[PDB]
Amino acid sequence: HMSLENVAFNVVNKGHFDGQQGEVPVSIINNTVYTKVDGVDVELFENKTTLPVNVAFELWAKRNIKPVPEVKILNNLGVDIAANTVIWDYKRDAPAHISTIGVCSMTDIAKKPTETICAPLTVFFDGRVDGQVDLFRNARNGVLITEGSVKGLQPSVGPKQASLNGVTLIGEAVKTQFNYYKKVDGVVQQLPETYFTQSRNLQEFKPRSQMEIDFLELAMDEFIERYKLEGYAFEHIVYGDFSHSQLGGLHLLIGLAKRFKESPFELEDFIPMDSTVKNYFITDAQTGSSKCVCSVIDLLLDDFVEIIKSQDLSVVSKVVKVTIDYTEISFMLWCKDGHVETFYPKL
Amino acid sequence: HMSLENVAFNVVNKGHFDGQQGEVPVSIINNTVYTKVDGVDVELFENKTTLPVNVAFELWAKRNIKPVPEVKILNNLGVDIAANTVIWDYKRDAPAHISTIGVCSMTDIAKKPTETICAPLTVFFDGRVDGQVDLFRNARNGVLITEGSVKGLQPSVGPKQASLNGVTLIGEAVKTQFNYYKKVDGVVQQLPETYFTQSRNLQEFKPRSQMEIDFLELAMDEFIERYKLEGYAFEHIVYGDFSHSQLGGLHLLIGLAKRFKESPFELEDFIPMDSTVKNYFITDAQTGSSKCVCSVIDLLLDDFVEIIKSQDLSVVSKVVKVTIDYTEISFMLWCKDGHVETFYPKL
Amino acid sequence: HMSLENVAFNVVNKGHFDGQQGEVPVSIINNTVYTKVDGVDVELFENKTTLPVNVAFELWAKRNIKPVPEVKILNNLGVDIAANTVIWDYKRDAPAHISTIGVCSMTDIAKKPTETICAPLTVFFDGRVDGQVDLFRNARNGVLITEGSVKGLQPSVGPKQASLNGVTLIGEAVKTQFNYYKKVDGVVQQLPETYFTQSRNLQEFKPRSQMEIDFLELAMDEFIERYKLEGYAFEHIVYGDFSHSQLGGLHLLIGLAKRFKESPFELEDFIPMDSTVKNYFITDAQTGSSKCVCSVIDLLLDDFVEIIKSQDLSVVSKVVKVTIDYTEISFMLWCKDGHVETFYPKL
Amino acid sequence: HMSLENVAFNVVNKGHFDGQQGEVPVSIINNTVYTKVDGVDVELFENKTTLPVNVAFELWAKRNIKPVPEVKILNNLGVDIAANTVIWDYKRDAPAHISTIGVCSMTDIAKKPTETICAPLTVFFDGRVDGQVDLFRNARNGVLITEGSVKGLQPSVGPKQASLNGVTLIGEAVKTQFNYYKKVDGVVQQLPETYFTQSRNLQEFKPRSQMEIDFLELAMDEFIERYKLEGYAFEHIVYGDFSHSQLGGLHLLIGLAKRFKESPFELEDFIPMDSTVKNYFITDAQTGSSKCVCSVIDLLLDDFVEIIKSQDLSVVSKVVKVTIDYTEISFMLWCKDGHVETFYPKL
Amino acid sequence: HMSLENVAFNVVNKGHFDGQQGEVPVSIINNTVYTKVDGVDVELFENKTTLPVNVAFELWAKRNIKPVPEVKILNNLGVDIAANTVIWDYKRDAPAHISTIGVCSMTDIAKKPTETICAPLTVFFDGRVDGQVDLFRNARNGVLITEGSVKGLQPSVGPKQASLNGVTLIGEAVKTQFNYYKKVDGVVQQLPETYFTQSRNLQEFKPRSQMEIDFLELAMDEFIERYKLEGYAFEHIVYGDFSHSQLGGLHLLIGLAKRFKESPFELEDFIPMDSTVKNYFITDAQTGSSKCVCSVIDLLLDDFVEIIKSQDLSVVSKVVKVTIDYTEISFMLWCKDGHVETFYPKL
């Protein structure tokens, strides 16, 4: 019993697609799913994906309502598909993966991931479900999370935060931290030591360190003198330059939080997706300085100092490799006469 | 267990909604119903109605696949709704009635016609189904059709033709004549004596009498001297003028048939529906004569002669009333010096 | 003089359809109504309803711009249609009723409510217009509202708030309180004594009682010792439980306002409409506790105390029937050893 | 009083917009104009243009229902706009010109052609309407067609056929020949001597000379020995090759009419418009020969003989220019040893 | 090399159309432009204009990213078109002008503004680009803006603010102050002395003078007694009347800012565009007073005191003409016994 009317019945009663039987009437008209409640037409789903409206409405249901890794973490690990679940990208308002395994007949390519066509793909397993660890050992290319310790395997501690129904949080009623594993052509590979993106919003920014709390509270001169930040040029990379028509640096999300509360500005998030690095179109109000492509990254302010306080200040120009979120991020460094001048994510 | 996937299953196997259980996948995209057959997307229904695509697709599957009265007959006998069936208007590619009685939940206004809301409405009953004659006796306003005599009521013989899956025919493997009955606010009313339109197409015209066979075969002068048609002016009403650039009469479909085979012309049905009187935009391709609103009617010609050979040729102008297809069509008559000049349906 | 260009003329000058004559050009393209103002194309209306764009644009105009009862009040009273007016459901961006009486020809089913077709329907009359009281006495099924006393009829005082152009308010320049009457098959029926939903928003929450001002200001222990709420378990029903993965209770809107200011959270309003009892999808952003179907209701905190301090604490489980907004709301009660454990709206 | 409901009223009663006052209800939904006739929705116009939805419906009702020059004649001349009329391109189901002069406010760029903005544009005037043959003397750039002679101007005889409601005909109840005049920046210019295309359809081909009647009746060798067509190679240019996989020649429309009746073939008009030279994708169904771009032109067979029996057969290759339909068509001519090998329109 | 794939490549890398070479795949589906980024479909542009989606997406990428005059300024000067640029109306999410010069082939009417078709139109030049001053001297109808003084021409200082990427600002890193010039049929005309609207938002209101800071801070009585505002009736025109059902006056934007912080209300901006005078639909959420058509204007409070303090208080009623934003705004004045009663923009 799998039908459009049955899916809408679960949406009207249990919120998401449970396993309950029953049907309610449905009207489809211009990428919108309607239902009749006491004689009125009520909207339930507005299609914004590249799929048919009835298929995406079935994929919006059955979505994973448990804490799952962020889409950027799954994309950096090369995950291509999900096993017996659907990871809903709450950004883009679309599924994070376009094909399914035993979920929706229109998007299904296999009933079970052990079929022959799923071998060259990177399948995503959730060890919190029974037997998923066994299928990961039998699979050829995959990624596994478990919350615990799987015998015989070496774990990699992942991000402390996770997305729950679109809300990125560090849970205490739940865990939201996973041990990551990965197989490539049958070989279990070692995930390298890495930094992690804090994933924070601009309008509800919160510090997470004593150094961060001081950065927001203290002035520009008082913060550089205490933590010994001379010559490393935090005035241009973090604070930002607004004197001329072109904006200076401003490549730390912490730099946007302090500036936003003192003077709002405009953001255009072209290419709206969840990437480790983000490019915004910035137009500073009050002043008028702007920049078309502004590469911004969110790191703990202590981590950015640890990265910059371990580089050779002698070379004029050098490409810097740093692994964040299980991928190599390229940085560009410029130095003059023993002090840096700029240090930003490479384009 | 009514669902969209179950309806499409009946369309694939049985052709129409046979009530069989089973489901097949369905994709809805831009007023089109698709299904997947061996990994290939196949079209099943293209919505051309004023209803949601998933509702009209269900009404099209539950259509009546038996000989039913033509829509113009149902519209002249002011029928508003159908009882436990769907009369599909094949000319408009839409249902002949918007509301239903126990057919589709989205369009249903009642489970059974004996409910309180259906009393002021004219309900269509089909005596060929069990118990429909009993409900017509209990109903307040309705129309009944039967193949038999029915006890206690006086029948009215209908037309010889009927629509079967869109094809108007006079069947011999099936019966296409119906005895018509009608109730208005309780009292059974006597249907008057009437003529019937033959409902014939232009590219597939067939005569149905000896006078018609002679009209096609013989010339203009040879047909008027026989049958004695002097003064009644059939040269203008039936044959046509074509001399001046404003077309004369040509108000008989039998006149369009003879003219079409000798030299074709253009027709525009700018109001596409099934009416007793049709108005076409005709442009003769040979001479160049044309007319914007040309009122055309299809009679046996043996009836049109009977209608015209029974009018007072003394008065110069008179509105003529004649009952065709259970409704009074108004005609305009002009005479001069004891002979007819023109005689056409009134707008 | 009724036309699309004339309606857009009234929108461009008077704001709504004021009945003035005149036309302005209009362009229709993909559920959007445009007009030309000084050579530029300006949007006027975006269709979000299940109706054609030109019909809904005419129904958006002619809307009632005076204080009218809320949709949930009309729905609980079983109102089916409106008489010579249009009640716009600002929550669904659509008409609250799909058929009209002498308003729009495309949606009209009658010119006057005294016609024979409108008898089995529940017609809404507005006593503030001339003669509407007389038509309510002649009607069979209907609901009447008045600002004063109608001679011979027993009134029922309604809520103190009403919607004015989508704004729920307790007016002082306008009344916004009505005496309610109702007829059923000709019999004037007695409306029961009932509670009323306050209809307040989460982001603009305002107390309306001394007990409510103390609930927001005082702590959890300080509010229960006063007012004497021991054993009645307000810690779980109103304050809520966030310790475990599943959220416990939290069924009072005043409990959402206190929690929202101390810690924001996510709400998914599936089935968006006015239904006295609302079901949201809660995801607490701080702890991570969540709940798919959370039945929330907005009552004066004094009224919920009056309801709970008048129930038998002996039975282990019992269905409680309380009339709110002219309808019976079913509650579920659980008790243990002389004290309650949970008390929520039943599903 | 111009409105959408008034235009549809004219479409219902009079067939086109003739200026009668009255309104009927109208519903727009997905590029379709509907109306309600006795409770059922009837389609009136299906938008296939690049215009909105109803603006094209108004332009379609105000079309010219009189014999007007074909679009290719108006396009070979520099005509850019029409004066107080609308020329409907029946091939593309769209107006032949986008802007109007005093016809539709949405598409109007001026009320009268002598309004400073229409000076650099070529305005089409119709001398059959009162005036205009005086505004053309006042206009800077324009084209005039008359049925007779105008004083002081030298006429140019146009083609014998014209389009009436989409039907190309040589009328005898109307006049389809026009005297053409043209002004460019003030000076009246001399139109050169030219050939005219016959504008004939494939499935309704009709000969127009004794040589054409002999071409269809007689065989290949019997037609070349008469009329003396040795060395000019009509076996390849008109008859066709069909022997090899690539199709040979076949650039005369009379060559298609003879071949189509002796067993058909497939044509794709992948650029649907009215041009003097048409390019078709032809695939022979009998042999299998085909050609992607096949340049076909419709000339009187006597005219093509007159064009080919007057070229220098000595040079091996030469670009030939001939004026057809008031434009220079380029031809490619190849010869060998004093006889023609191929002769086709240049791409 | 101009194509849809190349335009999208400039959107993903440089933010706007920088003229860089390269292509990326693109999917078009229902007024939405998609692209593939790491295997997912990402939205780039949502068409809300009256143009095709691929044409509007190209115009949006070629928008002017420098400070340009506001649309109301360009409209008050009668500007019809832009020269070699695109002025994007950020309020309407559409181009401020529908035709272009050497920008987009689909919307282009000329390559250079010196062509013969652009003469009767009012073209907009930007003096900050090379040679634009020379083309303005050669043009017939146009408007020039410069940051400095052009030799031989008399300048007119414009407003202090301008729009940069949709943000109206008084820049200090950029000028945003322009000298305005205008030609009419070759004659350079003198722009009159005028007032300027401040162009401020309600939720981010900021005073700009000592009188404005006092108006927001002080009470109603203390502001009138200090600046000698007796008899001029600022209580009704600026403060507003909320006692009765109809709202009184409130035609200054500074009066909306003071009321909004003390008591929020609703605004419906029907006819959404940038005009010197705005008409909103006001609904006060506290008292219930409302007004359908409320003409609101934003001037410096000192400028509104400069007016009214130079008017004859003797006449009972008289039309007042004051030039604001280079256009004559009409006001209505009512006086009684030496003191004014109302003074508002005329409808």
From Swiss-Prot, chains A, B, C, D, E:
AV-Nsp11N/CoV-Nsp15M domain residues are 64-189
Q: What is the effect of changing residue 114 to I?
A: In strain: Omicron/BA.2, Omicron/BA.2.12.1, Omicron/BA.2.75, Omicron/BA.4, Omicron/BA.5, Omicron/BQ.1.1, Omicron/XBB.1.5, Omicron/EG.5.1
On assembly, the entry states: Homohexamer.
List residues binding uracil. 291-295, 342-346
According to UniProt, where does the site described as Uracil recognition site lie? 295
Instruction: Output this protein's name.
Output: Uridylate-specific endoribonuclease nsp15
Which residues make up the annotated site Transition state stabilizer? 291
Give compartment(s).
Answer: Host cytoplasm, Host perinuclear region
Q: Which residues form the active site?
A: 236 (proton donor), 251 (proton acceptor), 291 (for uridylate-specific endoribonuclease nsp15 activity)
Q: Which cofactor does it need?
A: Mn(2+)
Quote the range of the complete protein represented: 6453 to 6797 of 7096
Query: Residue limits of the NendoU domain?
Result: 206-345
Native source organism of the sequence = Severe acute respiratory syndrome coronavirus 2 (2019-nCoV)
Q: What sequence ranges are listed for the domain Nsp15 N-terminal oligomerization?
A: 3-63
Q: Which gene encodes it?
A: rep
Show the catalytic activity.
uridylyl-uridylyl-ribonucleotide-RNA = a 3'-end uridylyl-2',3'-cyclophospho-uridine-RNA + a 5'-end dephospho-ribonucleoside-RNA
Q: How is the cofactor bound?
A: Likely affects Nsp15 binding to RNA.
Its biological function?
Plays a role in viral transcription/replication and prevents the simultaneous activation of host cell dsRNA sensors, such as MDA5/IFIH1, OAS, and PKR. Acts by degrading the 5'-polyuridines generated during replication of the poly(A) region of viral genomic and subgenomic RNAs. Catalyzes a two-step reaction in which a 2'3'-cyclic phosphate (2'3'-cP) is first generated by 2'-O transesterification, which is then hydrolyzed to a 3'-phosphate (3'-P). If not degraded, poly(U) RNA would hybridize with poly(A) RNA tails and activate host dsRNA sensors.
